[PDB]
Amino acid sequence: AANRAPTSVNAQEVHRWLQSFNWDFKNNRTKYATKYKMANETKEQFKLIAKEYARMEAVKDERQFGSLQDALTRLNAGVRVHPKWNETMKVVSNFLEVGEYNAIAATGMLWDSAQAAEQKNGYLAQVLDEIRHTHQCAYVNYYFAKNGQDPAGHNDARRTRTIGPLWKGMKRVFSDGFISGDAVECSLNLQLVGEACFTNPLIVAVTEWAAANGDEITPTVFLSIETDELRHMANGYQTVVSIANDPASAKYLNTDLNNAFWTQQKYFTPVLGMLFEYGSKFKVEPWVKTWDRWVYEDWGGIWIGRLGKYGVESPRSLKDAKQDAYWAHHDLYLLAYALWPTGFFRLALPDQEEMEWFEANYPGWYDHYGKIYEEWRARGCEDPSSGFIPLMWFIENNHPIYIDRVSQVPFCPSLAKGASTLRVHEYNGEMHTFSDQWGERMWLAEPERYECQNIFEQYEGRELSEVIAELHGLRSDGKTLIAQPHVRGDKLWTLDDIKRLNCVFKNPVKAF
Amino acid sequence: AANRAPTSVNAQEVHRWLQSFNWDFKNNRTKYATKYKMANETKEQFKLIAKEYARMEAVKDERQFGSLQDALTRLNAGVRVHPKWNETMKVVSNFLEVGEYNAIAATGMLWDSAQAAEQKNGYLAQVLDEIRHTHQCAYVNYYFAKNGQDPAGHNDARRTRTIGPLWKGMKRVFSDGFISGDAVECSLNLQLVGEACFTNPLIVAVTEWAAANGDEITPTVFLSIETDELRHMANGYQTVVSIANDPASAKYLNTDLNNAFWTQQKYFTPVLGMLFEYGSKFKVEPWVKTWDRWVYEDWGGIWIGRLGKYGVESPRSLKDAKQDAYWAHHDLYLLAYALWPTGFFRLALPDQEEMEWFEANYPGWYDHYGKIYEEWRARGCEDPSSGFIPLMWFIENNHPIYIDRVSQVPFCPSLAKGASTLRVHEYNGEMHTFSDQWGERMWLAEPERYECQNIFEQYEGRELSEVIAELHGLRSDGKTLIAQPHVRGDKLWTLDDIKRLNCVFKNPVKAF
Amino acid sequence: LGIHSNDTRDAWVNKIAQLNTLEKAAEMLKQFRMDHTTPFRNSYELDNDYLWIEAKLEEKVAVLKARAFNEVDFRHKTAFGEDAKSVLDGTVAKMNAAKDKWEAEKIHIGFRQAYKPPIMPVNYFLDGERQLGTRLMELRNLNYYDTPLEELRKQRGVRVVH
Amino acid sequence: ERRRGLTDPEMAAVILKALPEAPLDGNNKMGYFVTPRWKRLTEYEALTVYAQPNADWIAGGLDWGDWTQKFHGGRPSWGNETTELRTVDWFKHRDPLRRWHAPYVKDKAEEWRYTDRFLQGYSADGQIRAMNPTWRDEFINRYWGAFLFNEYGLFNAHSQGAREALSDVTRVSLAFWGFDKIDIAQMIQLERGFLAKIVPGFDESTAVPKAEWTNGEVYKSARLAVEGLWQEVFDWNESAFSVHAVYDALFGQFVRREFFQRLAPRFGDNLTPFFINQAQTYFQIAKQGVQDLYYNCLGDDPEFSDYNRTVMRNWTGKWLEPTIAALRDFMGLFAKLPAGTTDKEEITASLYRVVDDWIEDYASRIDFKADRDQIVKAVLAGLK
Amino acid sequence: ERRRGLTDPEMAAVILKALPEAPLDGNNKMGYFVTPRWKRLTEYEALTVYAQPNADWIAGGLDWGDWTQKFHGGRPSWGNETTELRTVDWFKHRDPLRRWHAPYVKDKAEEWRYTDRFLQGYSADGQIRAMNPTWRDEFINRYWGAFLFNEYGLFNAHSQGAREALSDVTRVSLAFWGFDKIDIAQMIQLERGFLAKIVPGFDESTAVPKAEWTNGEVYKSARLAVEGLWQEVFDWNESAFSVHAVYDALFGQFVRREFFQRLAPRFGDNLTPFFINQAQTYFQIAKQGVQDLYYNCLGDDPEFSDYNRTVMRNWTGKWLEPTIAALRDFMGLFAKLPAGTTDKEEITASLYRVVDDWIEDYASRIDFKADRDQIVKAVLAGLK
Ligand SMILES: [Fe+3]
Ligand SMILES: [Fe+3]
Ligand SMILES: [Fe+3]
Ligand SMILES: [Fe+3]
Ligand SMILES: [Xe]
Ligand SMILES: [Xe]
Ligand SMILES: [Xe]
Ligand SMILES: [Xe]
Ligand SMILES: [Xe]
Ligand SMILES: [Xe]
Structure with a gap:
């Protein structure tokens, strides 16, 4: 029996008093350098408490792991995916994994920066979400390694990623850019630009291409990840709202935003276009179309437009970004393929249908890239017995490949249908190579922030097979390379095939 | 902080003392009539407590519901199934549902019978498991109704099943056979025979046929149900062990076992093979082989053999069951199809490939059933404007269809390739029709246990469409019948189409 | 190697x-x-x-x-015996007296080269990172794009090889 | 190897080709014909209502005809003859908490796993240290331990109802009411098992508490009432009603809430309350279903309200006497407590809480005239 | 409509045709190169170890080279310079409970839903009726409520650590240690919000307990210690070690276990202990991880054991004084209790339990010579 209606208390009823949890003391201030003042009293959109946060995420996990462990496994979904996509997912899942990971630290920094309890609380949920995302991306690679057609790379990307050049650029946008700098600049890189402009649309697009390529594992996980992203957008919006009524905002916000925007697009523009168009059999949409909608229209227009009332304006480098875009991903794949022995994934030359698709969507593609790929195939780039690596063609044709000192994006000025700009400076006994006016200014103004050693500096004078060997770029048989210049089941290249080529790295800037 | 290692207590540590929970008092005895005595020191195989039981099943549920709600729905798995199989599952899931349901009450009766706390506990786990299974079978119909190609029937089988004759037999083996009689006879019908001989192997077989026919929903659910079955077979085995050391066992056990075996096989032998072979497009295995392996080998041989030490012998009616088995399913489908307007599902005539498959696996199939199906098709049985229902062919060719008073299984002795037995008796003003020697003895010895009114008795003098209308056998438009003689999406039969035929039921026994 | x-x-x-x-x-x-x-x-x-x-x-x-070092010194003295708090404060004071971004970067960069843990205790050093970085950025990020690259290259002092 | 129709190109092509243009019926709602209790049909209702194959001759059944096989003698599989209560429709009941199997086991599993963590934390935290040894060794071990038999008996009282319930909705509630009872009995043993692990010399054997239940004075009338409710009642409704709306509502609530939950804290015992919290949560969950079935559906039946109330009042009187005797004997436990533990004023107040709660939640719903003072005085006669 | 490659006959056939005959590598175990802590690699480890992209120059890192973008001034994204502690490998740590995101939110969610059912049960059961009003109104509302700010401060102390932790395993453990603290602060408010619902006139506003925390005497040194640990410490390890292995292990444990958990029961309060059960469960869970990181990995580091123990003993001494000060001011609360609630003998034994537990679990692990009597006597000095 008894008397009194069953009653309880929910998240909102507790959250109502959360702003009051913080109290005043002289040293109650952020531990991180910043030009800005995050207003105390700043509120958050989602009225969450730790327990309700856990419950909402647990239900999602239930669904996700249920699908993965039961039906998808029974359907052998880890196997029935196009070979090319199995390879792309090694990079997509592990590279995204590092962004999820660094985003945990970034939001810890933002939690520290915020003075209002609600704002700290908003960043806190994202701290927990990014841990969730780290483990989810890790799980995608775990699953493909456990149940797929080629586990190598999926099973050790955390260490095999270190052999190649594309990884350095990923660390710039999704690791260091997220945590090294004024907390606000990091927030712009992470939330306002990174998540709002690239990650949010990318995650869903990835599920589209995955599905097209027979992969139902990625949609299961990535669609679950995307359900948390709304709260992260709010955190980014709140960052701007929190600092907008301070004099520093008028002086600094737009340049931090412009620098963050350039930073993010510099890598994603060529890389994501490359992963989509060249890492798939079935295509969903040409990247030129996608990029314009995502960056120029959706983000550059609408999203940013909602921040105009806080003094935010369109990045001054947006025009430059659009101009450099068109051929960016095509230019990059040439280098990624030429440097295939340095990866932790297998790559393929575009087949006849793809070349036709490329030309139809990018007039002039065949005359430049198409002919080159055909020449490389004739030289025997797919065959272990050829003794040919495309990098050899770059040397024979006087086409040096440089690494941008700031973004880490590889570029070949003399070949590129895109940018073709190159700036080389010598300073205090060291030379630096830049690919654009924005990154050049970043280094000139902040040289001590950009001292990253490039692949050619570290591997200088080293023979390729010894680098691959020391960095564990081999499959379990201890001889066959993880990376390959084709996605077929045989004629796989071995360490000895690489050793016989006797490719010894040289630092290209030494030509100057 | 601490002082002492973290400690807890598990199910088994609590279970160690469960047998002692029951205590002695004069009226501590079963409330149900029984010839047997379940030993009060009987132990159970699974050392479970309520909490651990719940956790075990909760883990299974999250996996299952995760698959259904996430991946399978994203895959449109509710739709991409062969039309014939969509229909078969209306029957398979709802009919099995009543079995799970009555099994709850059966195990309640058994829990009341058991005097040992442990034995009661085992039966109790099953009570809860069968509740789980009821909601699971219900969910399969619910899922196909919500997301499938034809919701009618899946959406209301609990009331539309009452229109047809196949449902009557289902209630005998899986409803009344489980709960009406000596608790031990009920246990033999449920556990020793029903689950051990039919359900356990059937559930798995269903997932294979479902998978072949594009159905991934049923495997996800039925594979989950299967994980609980071993506990139930342990219950059946324990029932025998608990009563074996008492004088009553030698006098009565093999008789109750024989009666239970015949009861279950009488319905399942023709029905299962019919649902599999005629309810599918793609075939997994011919029923003749399956039946022989399940019933003769696995069960009658191995499974039963394990109970020999308790005085259990292979049922005396086994050879008779094998004799009548061969053509049983084929003979019955003719009847189910002839009476198609009384169902809650759509039936199809075998296509040309199936006809070849049937003749290949059942020589003589074509000149008997093949000819009949071809004649029916020629008469326009699939066409609503034909004015023909196969029931009419039976009437024209003098082949009365009877309903066994005991098993409720419909039989046509004059046309059957299998058994032709027909025994008709008049007793105290009423006639009774039997199809076999075993059921005849059951009625003669226990007439008051078998008074079930048959469809011809209930529907006597009624025009077909009036029966279908009253019992809600229509689709949502209130015109089209749920049941159909074809599985195509066009030219569906209407209530008026049936009314125009002016088919009025006659009690076949009035001809004597 | x-x-x-x-x-x-x-x-x-x-x-x-x-x-x-x-x-x-x-x-x-x-x-x-x-x-x-x-x-x-x-x-x-x-x-x-x-x-x-x-x-x-x-x-x-x-x-x-x-x-x-004894316990108090491990917490408050630099490896060279200087009072960490005094060095922290004096360095930050020099940074706050910096007249432009060029003087500012020299103060921050030099402070790192000389006092990075285990020289100065971490508590004092990171408090320095907090204060020094703030002023360095305030100075560097003001009118960040006003100086043309040709002139910025000369301010930095690079030898343009191109 | 195994080719699946959903993924195999050739097989899927065949399936896809046979598929209709759109679904053959737009009514994609399973259970659409069930009358919703609430605004819209719930999953609980859809998956449960009409699963029981009753014919129209058992109030509310949708089927027709006799059962196919009955008991020797002719007793029906299920029938009106198994209970005195009558109704317009046995399918009206709805568990207000809407529990079908999935949510029921989900919640219990959470409780099991959190219980495990709590115990790991309690043992690691050294919380037993401040627990009074006498309360621990005498009261928890023997007296609370003995109560496990009461809950076990109550669980067993449900066996016949699991077999005789006349509808799916009542059967599911009934099973869950019984399953919670056996869970509580096991939680009492679990505590004794935990104590045996963290307290040197503590014996988890049930011999002591069992002897207290089967031979002591304190629980004599309790055991007698339990034995009767379980084995002397053959009416499934009399059993569920008298167990939940009379005996356990008065005696059980007194022992769990007014004795142990109220007093254990005074002896530095937060361990027993951790489990009693589960018992009280379970009791309150069951109450809502018991109230819906016996009052909303049966006692307020548009045709049989007066009849059903007459029968339920008859059962209340029938079982109130042995329940009062149970409470009366239990009063003897107060004299065994250390001096100064509680007093007659607190005891009287606690009795009135139980009685008033019972009158409000159960007795008054059927117009049963309970005299709160008469009942409390009758119970206090076993105190002094 | 979209065509999926796994089910579309055309696309699947193209996919199937491209597949190799068997997997291109038999090694199907993701983090196979990770040194397992236990017999076989666990999921927790595979999904966590090496997620952090550290280069070899941060002990245990597998990458090479500098970070790509550093702070203005040159500070590294992560660097050895952020903590005094040194080690042969930052990836050595393992949460003994193996908590990655999934099991962590799973358990917390179970606790949340059970909390909801418990409150629904408690209120329906009318258990508030026998709770002492003075305890509820003064002690739970003001003093227990004030403690929310202590836990909140301890939560906030983790912010810098979330940013600076030098490995994935340490970052994950650290984040969970901090998230459990904010949860506890929120559970203290949740209880107050619950009382406001079931007790007329009870005000859930944090105004009163906040004023007690910011301006009262009982929590004066507590607040001073918290403000210090949070905002005056810039070393992520000093923060984590000092909070969990000094301050909270002594002050927090005393307040939660020896004051509120021990005394609330004497006032008919099983409500507060329900939430403290969670707090203590969380304390004991974090302890395992704190000990693994600071003792098993750092304090017992094969090359830096001596060094690390010197630094940790240093921090222990540094924070032991303000911790004692915190306990000392807290002794003032006993004088406010109703006469007869406790005595000096029980307070003294409770103090020894906390000190003795702290010495065995923490102090002794790094050879810190704590004098139990000396510590207890210093605290007792504040009784009134
Ligand atoms: Fe994320
Ligand atoms: Fe995010
Ligand atoms: Fe079952
Ligand atoms: Fe079963
Ligand atoms: Xe990526
Ligand atoms: Xe790619
Ligand atoms: Xe290379
Ligand atoms: Xe069936
Ligand atoms: Xe079947
Ligand atoms: Xe069928």
């Missing part, structure tokens, strides 16, 4: 193994930082190995410092 193990790294752990006093270890670490770290380093000869070598030198200084 390799990326993670090579002759130069080997040569350095041998030299580090010979340090036997906090003062010589701290001096070698400080000299190492002036010689091999930041864009202002005296030489780029150790570009591929200095980061790791520095860490090994830091370990030696740390271990010797914990043995040498």
Whole structure:
């Protein structure tokens, strides 16, 4: 029996008093350098408490792991995916994994920066979400390694990623850019630009291409990840709202935003276009179309437009970004393929249908890239017995490949249908190579922030097979390379095939 | 902080003392009539407590519901199934549902019978498991109704099943056979025979046929149900062990076992093979082989053999069951199809490939059933404007269809390739029709246990469409019948189409 | 030789193994930082190995410092015996007196080369990062794009090779 | 190997080709014909209502005809003859908490796993240290331990109802009411098992508490009432009603809430309350279903309200006497407590809480005239 | 409509045709190169170890080279310079409970839903009726409520650590240690919000307990210690070690276990202990991880054991004084209790339990010579 209606208390009823949890003391201030003042009293959109946060995420996990462990496994979904996509997912899942990971630290920094309890609380949920995302991306690679057609790379990307050049650029946008700098600049890189402009649309697009390529594992996980992203957008919006009524905002916000925007697009523009168009059999949409909608229209227009009332304006480098875009991903794949022995994934030359698709969507593609790929195939780039690596063609044709000192994006000025700009400076006994006016200014103004050693500096004078060997770029048989210049089941290249080529790295800037 | 290692207590540590929970008092005895005595020191195989039981099943549920709600729905798995199989599952899931349901009450009766706390506990786990299974079978119909190609029937089988004759037999083996009689006879019908001989192997077989026919929903659910079955077979085995050391066992056990075996096989032998072979497009295995392996080998041989030490012998009616088995399913489908307007599902005539498959696996199939199906098709049985229902062919060719008073299984002795037995008796003003020697003895010895009114008795003098209308056998438009003689999406039969035929039921026994 | 193990790294752990006093270890670490770290380093000869070598030198200084200093000094004195709080405050004061971004970067960068843990206690050092970085950025980020690149190249002092 | 129709190109092509243009019926709602209790049909209702194959001759059944096989003698599989209560429709009941199997086991599993963590934390935290040894060794071990038999008996009282329930909705509630009872009995043993692990010399054997239940004075009338409710009642409704709306509502609530939950804290015992919290949560969950079935559906039946109330009042009187005797004997436990533990004023107040709660939640719903003072005085006669 | 490659006959056939005959590598175990802590690699480890992209120059890192973008001034994204502690490998740590995101939110969610059912049960059961009003109104509302700010401060102390942790395993453990603290602060408010619902006139506003925390005497040194640990410490390890292995292990444990958990029961309060059960469960869970990181990995490091123990003993001494000061001011609360609630003998034994537990679990692990009597006597000095 008894008397009194069953009653309880929910998240909102507790959250109502959360702003009051913080109290005043002289040293109650952020531990991180910043030009800005995050207003105390700043509120958050989602009225969450730790327990309700856990419950909402647990239900999602239930669904996700249920699908993965039961039906998808029974359907052998880890196997029935196009070979090319199995390879792309090694990079997509592990590279995204590092962004999820660094985003945990970034939001810890933002939690520290915020003075209002609600704002700290908003960043806190994202701290927990990014841990969730780290483990989810890790799980995608775990699953493909456990149940797929080629586990190598999926099973050790955390260490095999270190052999190649594309990884350095990923660390710039999704690791260091997220945590090294004024907390606000990091927030712009992470939330306002990174998540709002690239990650949010990318995650869903990835599920589209995955599905097209027979992969139902990625949609299961990535669609679950995307359900948390709304709260992260709010955190980014709140960052701007929190600092907008301070004099520093008028002086600094737009340049931090412009620098963050350039930073993010510099890598994603060529890389994501490359992963989509060249890492798939079935295509969903040409990247030129996608990029314009995502960056120029959706983000550059609408999203940013909602921040105009806080003094935010369109990045001054947006025009430059659009101009450099068109051929960016095509230019990059040439280098990624030429440097295939340095990866932790297998790559393929575009087949006849793809070349036709490329030309139809990018007039002039065949005359430049198409002919080159055909020449490389004739030289025997797919065959272990050829003794040919495309990098050899770059040397024979006087086409040096440089690494941008700031973004880490590889570029070949003399070949590129895109940018073709190159700036080389010598300073205090060291030379630096830049690919654009924005990154050049970043280094000139902040040289001590950009001292990253490039692949050619570290591997200088080293023979390729010894680098691959020391960095564990081999499959379990201890001889066959993880990376390959084709996605077929045989004629796989071995360490000895690489050793016989006797490719010894040289630092290209030494030509100057 | 601490002082002492973290400690807890598990199910088994609590279970160690469960047998002692029951205590002695004069009226501590079963409330149900029984010839047997379940030993009060009987132990159970699974050392479970309520909490651990719940956790075990909760883990299974999250996996299952995760698959259904996430991946399978994203895959449109509710739709991409062969039309014939969509229909078969209306029957398979709802009919099995009543079995799970009555099994709850059966195990309640058994829990009341058991005097040992442990034995009661085992039966109790099953009570809860069968509740789980009821909601699971219900969910399969619910899922196909919500997301499938034809919701009618899946959406209301609990009331539309009452229109047809196949449902009557289902209630005998899986409803009344489980709960009406000596608790031990009920246990033999449920556990020793029903689950051990039919359900356990059937559930798995269903997932294979479902998978072949594009159905991934049923495997996800039925594979989950299967994980609980071993506990139930342990219950059946324990029932025998608990009563074996008492004088009553030698006098009565093999008789109750024989009666239970015949009861279950009488319905399942023709029905299962019919649902599999005629309810599918793609075939997994011919029923003749399956039946022989399940019933003769696995069960009658191995499974039963394990109970020999308790005085259990292979049922005396086994050879008779094998004799009548061969053509049983084929003979019955003719009847189910002839009476198609009384169902809650759509039936199809075998296509040309199936006809070849049937003749290949059942020589003589074509000149008997093949000819009949071809004649029916020629008469326009699939066409609503034909004015023909196969029931009419039976009437024209003098082949009365009877309903066994005991098993409720419909039989046509004059046309059957299998058994032709027909025994008709008049007793105290009423006639009774039997199809076999075993059921005849059951009625003669226990007439008051078998008074079930048959469809011809209930529907006597009624025009077909009036029966279908009253019992809600229509689709949502209130015109089209749920049941159909074809599985195509066009030219569906209407209530008026049936009314125009002016088919009025006659009690076949009035001809004597 | 390799990326993670090579002759130069080997040569350095041998030299580090010979340090036997906090003062010589701290001096070698400080000299190492002036010689091999930041864009202002005296030489780029150790570009591929200095980061790791520095860490090994830091370990030696740390271990010797914990043995040498009493508890209060371990918390409040630099490896060279200076009062950390006094150095922190004076350095921040110089930074706040900086008249432009050029003077400012020299103060911050130099502070790092000289006091990075285990020289100055971490609590004081990161409090310095908090204060110094703020002023450096306020100065650098003001009118960030006003100076044309041709002039910014000259301000920085690069030799344009192009 | 195994080719699946959903993924196999050739097989899927065949399936896809046979598929209709759109679904053959737009009514994609399973259970659409069930009358919703609430605004819209719930999953609980859809998956449960009409699963029981009753014919129209058992109030509310949708089927027709006799059962196919009955008991020797002719007793029906299910029938009106198994209970005195009558109704317009046995399918009206709805568990207000809407629990079908999935949510029921989900919640219990959470409780099991959190219980495990709590115990790991309690043992690691050394919380037993401040627990009074006498309360621990005498009261928890023997007296609370003995109560496990009461809950076990109550669980067993449900066996016949699991077999005789006349609808799916009542059967599911009934099973869950019984399953919670056995869970509580096991939680009492679990505590004794935990104590045996963290307290040197503590014996988890049930011999002591069992002897207290089967031979002691304190629980004599309790055991007698339990034995009767379980084995002397053959009416499934009399059993569920008298167990939940009379005996356990008065005696059980007194022992769990007014004795142990109220007093254990005074002896530095937060361990027993951790489990009693589960018992009280379970009791309150069951109450809502018991109230819906016996009052909303049966006692307020548009045709049989007056009849059903007459029968339920008859059962209340029938079982109130042995329940009062149970409470009366239990009063003897107060004299065994250390001096100064509680007093007559607190005891009287606690009795009135139980009685008033019972009158409000159960007795008044059927117009049963309970005299709160008469009942409390009758119970207090076993105190002094 | 979209065509999926796994089910579309055309696309699947193209996919199937491209597949190799068997997997291109038999090693199907993701982090196979990770040194397992236990017999076989666990999921927790595979999904966590090496997620952090550290280069070899941060002990245990597998990458090479500098970070790509550093702070203005040159500070590294992560660097050895952020903590005094040194080690042969930052990836050595393992949470003994193996908590990655999934099991962590799973358990917390179970606790949340059970909390909801418990409150629904407690209110329906009328258990508030026998709770002492003075305890509820003064002690739970003001003093227990004030403690929310202590836990909140301890939560906030973790912010810098979330940013600076030098490995994935340490970052994950650290984040969970901090998230459990904010949860506890929120559970203290949740209880107050619950009382406001079931007790007329009870005000859930944090105004009163906040004023007690910011301006009262009992929590004066507590607040001073918290403000210090949070905002005056810039070393992520000093923060984590000092909070969990000094301050919270002594002050927090005393307040939660020896004051509120021990005394609330004497006032008919099983409500507060329900939430403290969670707090203590969380304390004991974090302890395992704190000990693994600071003792098993750092304090017992094969090359830096001596060094690390010197630093940790240093921090222990540094924070032991303000911790004692915190306990000392807290002794003032006993004088406010109703006469007869406790005595000096029980307070003294409770103090020894906390000190003795702290010495065995923490102090002794790094050879810190704590004098139990000396510590207890210093605290007792504040009784009134
Ligand atoms: Fe994320
Ligand atoms: Fe995010
Ligand atoms: Fe079952
Ligand atoms: Fe079963
Ligand atoms: Xe990516
Ligand atoms: Xe790619
Ligand atoms: Xe290369
Ligand atoms: Xe069936
Ligand atoms: Xe079947
Ligand atoms: Xe069928």
